[PDB]
Structures are given as C-alpha cells and as structure tokens.
C-alpha cells in the first residue's frame, strides 16, 4: 500500500473500558521498545474502539509500521491477549 486500509489493523479482545489514548500509548511505547520502527517518532496515529465488540482499529502513519505491528499478535495488554489481524 497504501491504500488507506494498508495502514490499519484490527485488534480484538481489548480490555473492557480501555481508552483510545491508553491503547495508543501502549502500542507506541511497545513498538518503539521492540524496534518495530525504522523512522523517528510514534507509529500509531489513532485508535477507534468499536461500539463495544471488544475490538478496535489502529491507524498507523505508514504501511511499513502497520506490517511490523503484526508481530504483536498475542501481546498481553492489561491482562488480556490481544488478537491482531489484517482488516
Ligand atoms: Zn499519552
Ligand atoms: Zn477518537
């Protein structure tokens, strides 16, 4: 991509009551700690949490970073195993 869909991932099984910001911050921090970025700055632009099917869509600033974040399928966040997939 992109294609705009090439900059988004589905993330399932998110902790009930989590906020957009908390999710964004966690992915940003964790992706950076893990070296999943090659460019300076934060990969995640936005998080849209669905009405509440316990899922969200993450939007990334780049197609590369979106791809790298696939590595985080099954990452534990606030006691939950996140399910990460292409949309
Ligand atoms: Zn923050
Ligand atoms: Zn929002």
UniProtKB/Swiss-Prot annotation:
Family from the record: Belongs to the splicing factor SR family.
Source species taxonomy: Eukaryota, Metazoa, Chordata, Craniata, Vertebrata
Provenance organism: Homo sapiens (Human)
Subcellular location(s) of the protein: Nucleus
Lineage top rank: taxon: Eukaryota
Record's disease association: Developmental delay, dysmorphic facies, and brain anomalies: An autosomal dominant disorder characterized by global developmental delay with intellectual disability and speech delay, epilepsy, hypotonia, short stature, microcephaly, intermittent exotropia, and non-specific facial dysmorphism. Brain imaging shows a thin corpus callosum and/or delayed myelination.
Domain RRM positions: 7-87
Portion of the full sequence shown: 148 to 229 of 475
Function description: Plays a role in pre-mRNA splicing and 3'-end processing. By recruiting PRPF19 and the PRP19C/Prp19 complex/NTC/Nineteen complex to the RNA polymerase II C-terminal domain (CTD), and thereby pre-mRNA, may couple transcription to splicing. Induces cardiac troponin-T (TNNT2) pre-mRNA exon inclusion in muscle. Regulates the TNNT2 exon 5 inclusion through competition with MBNL1. Binds preferentially to a single-stranded structure within the polypyrimidine tract of TNNT2 intron 4 during spliceosome assembly.
Record's subunit section: Interacts with U2AF1L4. Heterodimer with U2AF1. Binds unphosphorylated SF1. Interacts with SCAF11 and SNW1. Interacts with ZRSR2/U2AF1-RS2. Interacts with RBM17. Interacts with PRPF19; the interaction is direct. Interacts with POLR2A (via the C-terminal domain); recruits PRPF19 and the Prp19 complex to the pre-mRNA. Interacts with KHDC4 (Isoform 2). Interacts with ZRSR2. Interacts with the SF3B complex composed of SF3B1, SF3B2, SF3B3, SF3B4, SF3B5, SF3B6 and PHF5A.
Impact when changing residue 7 to W: In DEVDFB; likely pathogenic
Protein name: Splicing factor U2AF 65 kDa subunit
């Amino acid at each position: 991509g992109p294609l705009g869909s090439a900059r988004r991932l589905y993330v399932g099984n998110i902790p009930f009551g989590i906020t957009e910001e908390a999710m964004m911050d966690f992915f940003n921090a964790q992706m950076r700690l893990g070296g999943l970025t090659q460019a300076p700055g934060n990969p995640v632009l936005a998080v849209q949490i669905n009405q509440d099917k316990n899922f969200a869509f993450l939007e990334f600033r780049s197609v590369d970073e979106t791809t790298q974040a696939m590595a985080f399928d099954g990452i534990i966040f606030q006691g939950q195993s996140l399910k990460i997939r292409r949309p």
